[PDB]
Design a protein around this nucleic acid. Structure first.
Lengths: 47, 144, 35, 134, 185
RNA sequence: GGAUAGUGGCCUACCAUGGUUUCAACGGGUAACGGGGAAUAAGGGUUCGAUUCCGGAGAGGGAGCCUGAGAAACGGCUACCACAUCCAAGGAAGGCAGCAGGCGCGCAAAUUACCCAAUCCUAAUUCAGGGAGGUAGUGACAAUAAAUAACGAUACAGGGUCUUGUAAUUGGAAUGAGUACAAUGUAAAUACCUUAACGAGGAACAAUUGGAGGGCAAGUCUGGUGCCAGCAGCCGCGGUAAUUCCAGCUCCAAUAGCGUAUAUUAAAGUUGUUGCAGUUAAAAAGCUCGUAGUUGAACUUUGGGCCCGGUUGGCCG
């Protein structure tokens, strides 16, 4: 919790950031839309 | 018609009719008299720093409680005493007596998320550190 | 009484005819523990 | 790089100071940089210069490398190139020698030490030696 | 007391930041050109608005007014030479009907992708910032370069930048060092 | 007449009784230096301008004056007032609203650094000097440009013999953040530009700040704590003026930026000249006369004819 004195010289692998993050949204949003219910839902729980 | 002079040499009336009716405003009249410099707890200031005196149990109700209670603080420049607002519980152990907090206006309110009447000064910093960083375990507050 | 207010206005917009999301057990909760 | 080339643009014969200005442009396709003293050398036998009489002082490598542009001026007859040139370039070329003097603060504190003394103080030193001892 | 160096903003955030029609419109632009943030669309929609506003106040002016003739033909020349207009739409009534995607099409990373050399639009951007693509003879790493019509045919690989020969990179160099001491002997 | 560099009630002697004002005189307030200008944009406007330029004034408060072409000068003097320094107790010395710096104040503001190399200025003068100025340090005031990955192969899911997504599957390429010979840079350095050498396989070289009844963009999510004279009784369900009591998951926006507070502007036609409203919602004087103010019927060379030389489109080229 405390910062290290000499520091300045579950886990899921990180999302890309910046330009590559927008590539993830553009793939996710609309190229090959994953879940289709006729109204394009965006965040379901247990279906 | 329309109830006002309109002819081409009537600019004196149109200039001074507006001047008197502007006094029935609220932002304009509060600005020219400078009531920020005469009556407000903040002397026209955005923030103010003050010494906390005591902490109040201004609680939601008796024991089954939505705990949002805060303190009685005297501003250091004009010497006026105001009522403060602290965030959620767990920050009351930070604010002891005589900590010299830096407090800002509260302002916006809805019909939820804090509906306490009579308080308009949230506490931003205590003892010169923070309350966001002190609550989220970024730093520690020195004891007086 | 925040939960009473949030439900009270919500079926009012059924009668007014506008979209509104269907509910769950976060309706009257502080979505954010504050600063 | 097979060979670096130097190109002189906007040459101005300046008999007011008996020198010539020119915008020196050097193409170094690979190596690292200009190596100014080699340009001091190459701008000697570019015509006839007797290399102490040539001078280059501004240089800036273009973005991405390869091209470097700058200002360079050549005198004739190095004797007045000793005169018209500023001192800091002659020290930079090693043609003159850097004089050693005190800092700004010590020079001025020395100046105001004298400003309180009227005359040479040769009487005062004799006065205060008698004053301290006797 | 030196003269104040003038500065000005080159982008403007929208007044209505949350509309599902425009939020999907700008995200469509970001994916197909590979834009880092929404400032890039904001910047184009700023200078596009400046061009349309300047040309709009010229159109209130009458015909054959030399202020309109001089400034108008200047604005037509600048957009055609960049390449936003074609050669058949050199009139002030067509610059009002310009679109944001016309400017984005004239970028460097968009143009280097249209000339082969990229195989994807995001590879076009990351190739440029690694100081590989040189316009004419000078190495650029700015993806908003706005390639002119005359400098269209000069976009190649630099004489540096190991994809154009000249002493491959450090990753291959260490790789060449490793197989020299392992498989060489 | 005196005085001044000089006009002039500027002062003096005498003699007149004038001068300003409802077209706002005079007095009062200004948390008022004036202006070029700044923000805000459908127009007109509203608000701001201590602050890089021009002009004014002041050097703790007043006054008086020497020198000089020029000063009512304060990095000049004299006196008084208010602070304040030294001591041998007799006396002496003061003025950072100049540059660094410190105390006090407050929400609120940097190094007791380097140099005259540039820009210019002063002098007896190419040479000396300049906290004027420049260089550098601190500096998320504000502004510009855009790193945090790209490509291939294998196996599945597709659209369907050519096109995409998925995987603790796999492969080599490329590069700067860094360190650093050298060189450029600079008064001398730092830094930028160039570059020999080292420098990427994810808990590496790991991006945050906010938000999810509508605004509005984003949940028929989860766990735990406390209460119910509520149903049921192996479990649970529901409420909970716990205005959700405490945490987590998921999703959305902006992005090396983001949130909050105060002020102001747009939205705003809630200051309305453009452009509000007064029957019943705020608001038509109880009624009439009447000065300033504002506004005020129509009417006096209209028409016709002649030629001349022009700028625009064309039948024409």
């Amino acid at each position: 919790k405390v910062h290290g004195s000499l520091a300045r010289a579950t886990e899921k692998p990180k999302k890309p950031k910046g330009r590559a993050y927008k590539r993830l949204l553009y793939t996710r949003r609309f190229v090959n839309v994953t879940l289709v219910n006729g109204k394009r839902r965006m965040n379901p729980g247990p279906s | 018609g329309k109830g006002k002079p309109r002819g081409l040499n009537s600019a004196r009336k149109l200039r001074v009719h507006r001047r008197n009716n502007r006094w029935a405003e609220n932002n304009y009249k509060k600005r020219l008299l400078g009531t920020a410099f005469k009556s407000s707890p903040f002397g026209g200031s955005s923030h103010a720093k003050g010494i906390v005196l005591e902490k109040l149990g201004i609680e939601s109700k008796q024991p089954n409680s939505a705990i949002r209670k805060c303190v009685r603080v005297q501003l250091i420049k004009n010497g006026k005493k105001v009522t403060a607002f602290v965030p959620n519980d767990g920050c009351l152990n930070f604010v002891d007596e005589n900590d010299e907090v830096l407090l800002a206006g509260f302002g916006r309110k809805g019909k939820a998320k804090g509906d306490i009447p009579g308080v308009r000064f949230k506490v931003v910093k205590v003892s010169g550190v923070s309350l966001l960083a002190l609550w989220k375990e970024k730093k520690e507050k020195p004891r007086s | 009484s925040a939960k009473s207010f949030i439900l009270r206005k919500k079926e009012l917009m059924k009668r007014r005819g506008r979209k509104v999301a269907k509910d769950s057990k976060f309706t009257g909760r502080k979505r954010r523990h504050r600063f | 790089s097979d060979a670096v080339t130097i190109r002189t643009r906007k040459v101005i014969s300046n008999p007011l100071l008996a020198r010539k200005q020119f915008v020196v442009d050097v193409l170094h396709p690979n190596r690292a940089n200009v190596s100014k003293d080699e340009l001091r050398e190459k701008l000697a036998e570019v015509y006839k210069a007797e290399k102490d009489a040539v001078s280059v002082f501004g240089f800036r490598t273009q973005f991405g490398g390869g091209k470097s542009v700058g200002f360079g001026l050549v005198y004739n007859s190095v004797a007045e190139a000793k005169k018209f040139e500023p001192t800091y370039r002659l020290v930079r070329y090693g043609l003159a020698e850097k004089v050693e003097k005190a800092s700004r603060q010590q020079r001025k504190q020395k100046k105001n030490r004298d400003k309180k003394i009227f005359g040479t103080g040769k009487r005062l030193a004799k006065k205060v030696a008698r004053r301290n001892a006797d | 007391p030196r003269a104040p160096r003038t500065y000005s903003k080159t982008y403007s955030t929208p007044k209505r930041p949350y509309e599902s029609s425009r939020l999907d419109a700008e995200l469509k632009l970001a994916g197909e050109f590979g834009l880092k943030n929404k400032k890039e669309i904001y910047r184009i929609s700023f200078q596009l608005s400046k061009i349309r506003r300047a040309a709009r106040d010229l159109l209130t002016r009458d015909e054959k007014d030399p202020k309109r003739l001089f400034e108008g033909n200047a604005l037509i020349r600048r957009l055609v030479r960049v390449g936003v207009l074609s050669e058949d739409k050199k009139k002030l009534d067509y610059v009002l009907a310009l679109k944001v995607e016309d400017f984005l099409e004239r970028r460097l990373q968009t143009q280097v992708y249209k000339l082969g050399l990229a195989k994807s639009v995001h590879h076009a951007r990351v190739l440029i910032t690694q100081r590989h693509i040189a316009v004419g003879k000078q190495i650029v790493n700015i993806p908003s370069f706005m390639v002119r019509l005359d400098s269209e045919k000069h976009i190649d690989f630099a004489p540096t930048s190991p994809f154009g020969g000249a002493r491959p990179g450090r990753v291959a160099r260490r790789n060449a060092a490793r197989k020299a001491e392992a498989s060489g002997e």
